[PDB]
Design brief:
- Six copies of one chain form a homohexamer.
- By secondary structure, chain A is α/β, with parallel strands linked by helices.
- Chain A has one domain (2-300): Ribonuclease Z/Hydroxyacylglutathione hydrolase-like (Metallo-beta-lactamase, Chain A, 4-Layer Sandwich), CATH 3.60.15.
- Helices cover 22% and strands 20% of the residues of chain A.
- Chain A is built from eight helices and 14 strands.
- Chain A has a seven-stranded mixed β-sheet with strand order 6-5-4-3-2-1-14, covered by helices on one side. The first copy, chain A, has a seven-stranded mixed β-sheet with strand order 7-8-9-10-11-12-13.
- In chain A, helix 7 (223-232) crosses helix 8 (254-263).
- The longest helix of chain A is centred in the middle third of the chain and has 10 residues, at 106-115.
- Chain A is globular.
- Chain A starts with a helix and ends in a 16-residue tail after the last strand.
- Chains E and F meet through helix 1, helix 2, helix 3 and helix 4 of E and helix 1, helix 2, helix 3 and helix 4 of F.
- Chain D: GO terms for molecular function: hydrolase activity; L-ascorbate 6-phosphate lactonase activity; manganese ion binding.
- Chain D: One of its GO terms (biological process) is L-ascorbic acid catabolic process.
- Chain D: Belongs to the UlaG family.
Chain lengths: 300, 299, 302, 304, 302, 302
Amino acid sequence: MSKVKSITRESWILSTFPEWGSWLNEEIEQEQVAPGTFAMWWLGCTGIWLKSEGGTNVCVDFWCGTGKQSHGQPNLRTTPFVLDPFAIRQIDAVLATHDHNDHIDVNVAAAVMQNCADDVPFIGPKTCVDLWIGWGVPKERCIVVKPGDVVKVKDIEIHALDAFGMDDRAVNYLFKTPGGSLYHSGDSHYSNYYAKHGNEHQIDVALGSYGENPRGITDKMTSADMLRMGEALNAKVVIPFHHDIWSNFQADPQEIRVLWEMKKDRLKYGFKPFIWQVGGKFTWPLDKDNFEYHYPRGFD
Amino acid sequence: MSKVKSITRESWILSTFPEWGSWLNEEIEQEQVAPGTFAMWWLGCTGIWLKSEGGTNVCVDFWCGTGKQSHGQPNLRTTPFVLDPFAIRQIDAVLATHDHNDHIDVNVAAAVMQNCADDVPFIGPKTCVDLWIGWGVPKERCIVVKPGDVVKVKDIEIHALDAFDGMDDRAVNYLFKTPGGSLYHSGDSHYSNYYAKHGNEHQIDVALGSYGENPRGITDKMTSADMLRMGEALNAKVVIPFHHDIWSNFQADPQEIRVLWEMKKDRLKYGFKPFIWQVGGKFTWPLDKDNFEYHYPRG
Amino acid sequence: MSKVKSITRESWILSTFPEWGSWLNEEIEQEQVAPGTFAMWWLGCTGIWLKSEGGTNVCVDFWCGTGKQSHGKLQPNLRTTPFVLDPFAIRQIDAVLATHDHNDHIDVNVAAAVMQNCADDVPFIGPKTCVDLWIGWGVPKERCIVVKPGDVVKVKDIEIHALDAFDRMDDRAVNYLFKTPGGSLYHSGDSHYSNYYAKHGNEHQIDVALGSYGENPRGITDKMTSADMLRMGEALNAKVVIPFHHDIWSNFQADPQEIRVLWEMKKDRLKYGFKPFIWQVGGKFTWPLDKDNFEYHYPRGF
Amino acid sequence: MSKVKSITRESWILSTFPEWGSWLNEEIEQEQVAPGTFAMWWLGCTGIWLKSEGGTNVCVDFWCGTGKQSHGNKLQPNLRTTPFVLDPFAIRQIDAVLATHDHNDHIDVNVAAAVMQNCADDVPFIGPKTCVDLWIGWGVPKERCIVVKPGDVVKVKDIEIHALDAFDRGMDDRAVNYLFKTPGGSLYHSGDSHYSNYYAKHGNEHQIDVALGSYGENPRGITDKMTSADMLRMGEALNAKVVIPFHHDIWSNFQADPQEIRVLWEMKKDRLKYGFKPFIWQVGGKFTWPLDKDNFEYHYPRGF
Amino acid sequence: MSKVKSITRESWILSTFPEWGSWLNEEIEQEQVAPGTFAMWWLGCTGIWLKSEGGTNVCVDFWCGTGKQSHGKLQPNLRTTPFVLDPFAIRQIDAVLATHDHNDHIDVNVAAAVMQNCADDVPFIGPKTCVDLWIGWGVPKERCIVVKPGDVVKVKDIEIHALDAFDRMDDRAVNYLFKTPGGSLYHSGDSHYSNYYAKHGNEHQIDVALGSYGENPRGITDKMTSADMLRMGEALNAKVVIPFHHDIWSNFQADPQEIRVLWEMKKDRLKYGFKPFIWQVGGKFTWPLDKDNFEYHYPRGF
Amino acid sequence: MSKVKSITRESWILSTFPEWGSWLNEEIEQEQVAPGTFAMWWLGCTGIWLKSEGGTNVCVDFWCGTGKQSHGLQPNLRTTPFVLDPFAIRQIDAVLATHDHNDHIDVNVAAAVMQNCADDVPFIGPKTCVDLWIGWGVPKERCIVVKPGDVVKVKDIEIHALDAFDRTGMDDRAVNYLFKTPGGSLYHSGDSHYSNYYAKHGNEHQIDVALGSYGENPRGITDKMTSADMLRMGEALNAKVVIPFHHDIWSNFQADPQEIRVLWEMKKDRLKYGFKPFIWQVGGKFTWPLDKDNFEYHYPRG
């Protein structure tokens, strides 16, 4: 019968996707996080897997949908899939910052629900818990959080903070590990309340939604805002994310670096920028002065 | 059933992939290429779809595989799938530069065989048709080409030139001469002085070169400096890197090409400009020749 | 009598200030704006003098106050720009405008000077909050025109379009668009960035656009970033984008080159249809003559 | 009676100027200069206030005039583009007044008047012959004046002031350069000297920490200020650790971009093994040696 | 005997030097200068060869000496440029010019070569002191033309203007302005910066300007800085500013890219009407064909 | 008799050339190389003089010819003067050549050493180079043939012969040299193209300073390494300093070494480069490890 006639569309898709298979699922599993450090992976968009030195695995904003698949905004997904949600086994908590599509996913929920411990909590704002319950997540499996709330997941202390009434909609997270803290801001705009968090907490690595806003739209932070956030949070490292995912929001992360160079001495910036790549790993504090990530080029 | 129980790995995949669905298939179909111009789309890696003013569609090196999927060379595919091969309907020729896995695809051949006219030729070197016939493509739909051969597909005249990856059976370079202009496809060739031969013998408007960051001890992709040397030798007006998008381990900054060009262009009287493309994006010769950098539509 | 004994603090101040004397007052008065063009002067902060081809003289946000003069609210805001125009030397004027009631935009001494030295013909134009200041200061209500987004005021050659302001509403602040036969000028006052710049860019033709720029202190959002300046120019579909307000406050001192560098990186990819322009206080701009200049420099002589 | 009807031109001027009021006067007075350091303030043009660790206050080239105020009709279009950061009439604590040369921009009758009325009986006026002559004429008693030639040393409380050679394009009676040696470091004030090879002489003979040079964009057909490349050559010649441009702030027609110095420095520093860094100051701003020597660019206090 | 045993130091030298041989000699002779243009060659240091459309050949500041050849003019000055032109291969010439008497500009071996090889009529034009040296070396006084600032010497279709120099006078140093039908060339010899460049720019139409460039050692001023190179271009109202002299001495090694970088920062703000141009020794320049190239490269062949 | 008639072409040449005379010859023998260091000089092209802490003198690929001297066949003209006089060489311990190409071997240098130096100084190179040396008259007994793998000890300098790299067996024609001294090592690649086997040399040996043949390739020619290649070689060799040479000698191959620096500034952090580039000048000195961080060389200024 030959191959050019026995092959169907379904047979191609289901043997090719996701792009990375379970390579990163395995890498995360095999990672031994040294004392005094923490490890994290960029999962696309605002998705971050976080692993403390105690071995605690935390997943925040992991999204596995796509953009426009037909003509029937031109938002097309420009990043591949680095992590297979259905290959996830070890997990200690699933988190969401807000209920916007790019941040919360049914497939991630379904995957965890089928394959993981009947004990893994789904942590998010009221509207996210609402959205989870509707997909079939039991209410007892959910932890509703609002600004001020502190959730202890093993050695990872999760602080829910203000995002920019709205206490139902969105939160920012500060992940306190024994090796360092991670600030995750979701799809938030720039707010002066970043400075409040910088005054009340020690923040090491800060993540913020970067992207090129189309004419007449403001949904992402600019290159200048990225630096203002780093200054306000008193961070040591500022990493842009979210700029990877959408065709129409395609942005140059180098803008952040160039402005940083111009402003760092005059404004006494106490942080460095760092340009990540999707699927890539970051280790605090080992990678803090690196500036630019590159994938493993080969073992050799 | 709740969605956390009904959804499986397989249904999620069939719902999400390819990422772009048929969006680009539809855009390529709707594209009215104006006289004196040609349109093309970057399909990932060295994959190029070309459409001339006469509506002639051509697909070169369209690869739909992936890199490593498990730990059981750490090459991971870093490019999403912008085109659905099984959505292809209008096509006049399928082309391959060489037999290397990243340039010839069974699923693409299967898709064209199932959905397109029994008139569409499969053009490539001897090693390529051997794979095609082996997969079940009729020997009658394949055309074997070697350096020097010229094939006519509607208004697009395809010139098979020397490749720089015995040899002649394995790999060729293509020069697609349309009425609107010409395109040079170098596949995965290394740098060669014989680019000067092509630039001397042929009018070359746009040129594509395999670009990437070579790992320590490996030479497989052209450097930023070689990209500009290729442009000079081919006497092109636009130089566009490709291939740098696909493999994680070869991740390269195409801005190096621009920076070197800014330093060298006046001194060396460069007749071309560099262009930084994005996968899934369109390029129109000659309208986009001075754009320097591609941005996706913003809406 | 010796000079070290005859000189008093008041005698020094009265012969030195304002720094430029009536130099700019003279230059503006004698400037003959060519047909098909308009002339413009930066008066510090967001203060702008505009002169049409028909000789219409319009003044916006002219501020003549200063910052802190002693240690004893909180903020160490010190005026870092000299006084380029003498308000009490203003003679030929057609309209006096203000974007909002904020300190740096509405001035008692400028109003007083106009009342004492200019024609009773000259209208004071601004939002409800601004006229409430003017009336309470001594400007008669018949001289004032209250404006809102949508309102159009014709002053001889110049047509003034009051548009939506994005200060943080309609009683508090307005943006201005000045239509002259030579071209248009967008004055955004002290507005933060908003998407409605695109609205104004769609409905109106905008040639030159001014935006409040500055280096925001930690935990403050009061001025626009260098990136926002480029977004404003894109949304307004302007041909020239010019920062201002970054001159006036010590603690808001910014680098206008930041805008140029970001522009160079973006211009091709984003297809920017405008150029940035770095201006200097007391300086002149002539649309469209100076649109491709990039940077202003004061007259050098010789 | 309404404000509009009562306010005059004089009442506005007298309640607005000088722009900074007495803010900087108070800051200087309150400033506690740490041992091993010296504090310093840019007063505009080439005006420098210097305060040593022992509390000694020194005022150099302080100028409180302005440029053109009207047209009239030949002359250059010089408009003062710097505000007034310091009120001369609010000066109380001072140990010495100095001038580099007799030029209009470097010596001020109103500053002299203010000091004579408000300050101590024994505060000296240090300068070359011609500045002393000018001072004496204004009514400054001559017993309060100290004439200095290149070579002379004047010990004012805590600060050893060395009078050195100044440069044009005779001279000893017209202009001098100052090297201020404090227990916390040394300051080289070159006034409005054009570049000269004898900067190497002062660099060889003296330890110089901070160097100030008159920078500016010279108009076509004029050479009055030093270029950007000149500024770096001065730093190398003086063997300084910090090089700060001044004088570029004051005149509209001499508007210069200080970043020009930084860029050239980045191009030349390693090849020529420069032992200094440039520093871009702002008028009214404080500098502290050696704490700020690596800062590159000044910014005014921002607050919260 | 074998090659290893027979070869002498002196024979090798004669076989090897000058480096370029007669390559540039042949190139200059064969050069068909198009109407409305002029050709130019950099001979090293301040040495220039000019050729008008009529075929008139003029040679300025050609010097064939070298620096220190041993340890034992008391500092390490090594010649860092090869010899691109052989003076003892020169045939056609219509004038020999020198700007001043200092060792690096006037040369005995060149003067001798023109007398021995080149035809009669050929004048030696220079200031008073250079004439004393030519006569002192054995050039007939009938062949020497003494020039002061203000003198005009016509050499076929080339009109030579002797202007003021700015070394360290009138008898000692002159600057030249060469007027050809194709264009003009300003040659400033070894002059430092002066305000009188503006005088020449007002009175004459200057196309190409050459100035002595170099990195001044500590405590020495002998060459112009990159910034002064730009001030000269502005003063002369040139269209093209080309640095020379920076090639010759090891201790003066300079980066002409400084001129370009400073130009990119000032061009717009200061409205420069010229372009910088980085040449290479032995290189050719064609006004106005090359005025926008920015940088020179030697021919590459193939 | 006049000085103008006495002078001949020969008198000029034999008094002016070589340009540097014996300046560098004296400096080399004067040099006191410190313990834990090595010093080296750039003799033009790929010519390197290396001097150990023990006073061992090594001379690699010293060339003293020139390019084209007449038109009547690429236009390759020598753009570098002569810094070292071969006939002033006295103290020498070994003479080395990497391959038999014209630009890397010289009869006059061989002749000079034969005549003026000790009778036990070996001539080291691949067999194609000794065939040339014997053919010129050097006794076969004083010649050491090398292949990749061979190690030759010359005092405290351990000389490793490694694989050289041609594009399109070869061990007869070309080798690469790794010079191991007690104070550090030096990798000299000769005129090799880029190769993957630089990584083999990097893993097996400890390499401090690396030298690569740089230059601008003409259209349709691949003879020199690109700027990007220079960086790749540094990474492969695991070097700490990467220095380009060869780019100096030919007019047609004129290149800008700053490209290597700029590309390095873009790549260094992303790729974790353990080396940094160094721009040398011909005749200059390099001291490892003292000058490893200098980035750019400048000639002594005095």
